[PDB]
């Protein structure tokens, strides 16, 4: 019983460890999302500006 208790207690604090990981994860998941959206407009308006460029020097 007591061996099994301790063996469960291992997974207990390991669960708390994986939550101690999610404290970093959620931050990473947020900040990658912060740039993911941001890059598409810089890319589309760059394609636009390049459209203005390429029409002058046919």
């Amino acid at each position: 019983l007591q061996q099994t208790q301790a063996q469960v207690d291992e997974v207990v604090d390991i669960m708390r460890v994986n939550v101690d990981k999610v404290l970093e994860r959620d931050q990473k998941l947020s900040e990658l999302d912060d740039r993911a959206d941001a890059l598409q407009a810089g890319a589309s308006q760059f394609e636009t500006s390049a459209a203005k460029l390429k029409r002058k020097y046919w």
Partner: protein, 286 residues
Amino acid sequence: AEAMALLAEAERKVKNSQSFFSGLFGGSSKIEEACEIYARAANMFKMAKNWSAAGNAFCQAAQLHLQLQSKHDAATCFVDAGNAFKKADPQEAINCLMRAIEIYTDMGRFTIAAKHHISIAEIYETELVDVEKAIAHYEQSADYYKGEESNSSANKCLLKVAGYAAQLEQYQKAIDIYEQVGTSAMDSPLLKYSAKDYFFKAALCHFCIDMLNAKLAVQKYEELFPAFSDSRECKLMKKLLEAHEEQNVDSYTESVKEYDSISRLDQWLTTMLLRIKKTIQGDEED
């Protein structure tokens, strides 16, 4: 060269001239350099912890960018200006967030708009508490997230819609909302083990409703009832409406304590439980 000097030095060059200073062109080459002065200025106002001429400078950095040809990055700078007043003490981030969605939607970029359509709902629910309008942004933003097919984004928004239907006390609409989404979770093995809880939300949202919708929506949910979270989900509910339709608050309020011992209840659940707890007492005595 301070942030305060950049505003007045850009004020020199913002002038719309028609003279030998102009020639033939206007100030179309000049409205960008003005926006550049403000692009540096709005940056360094925050560096001086201004936070209020910061946000106004983030506004001015895009305000003049409108008149060039380009609302797009001007719109990104409106979102940035909303990140100024939002973090700061005052509002008027909410204004620039209107200024943003009215532009990105005006191209079809609903997702970028929806990044902060939700944040508008966040301010209008947390700060400027306008829960009918906040929910009009959660539900509407959910409609946009389904516009680009992202089901779980809209399930996140619609749980703000329906989660606060309990505090908005619209239990008849809450039961209208948690059903289709849990059915969208029986299909998903990625999402199933919260689906029982999703229909528990649809189940528990009673206004003292003794429809067997409460006893049938759980039946709809395909369910091996000796499963391992169902003892804490479904037969729970059957026990609780066993006592409501008993006209007995005694065992109704014993099993709630029986259940909190095995899964600690939260504000939303506990409020809904004591909401229905008043419903038995509202008929036994009177």
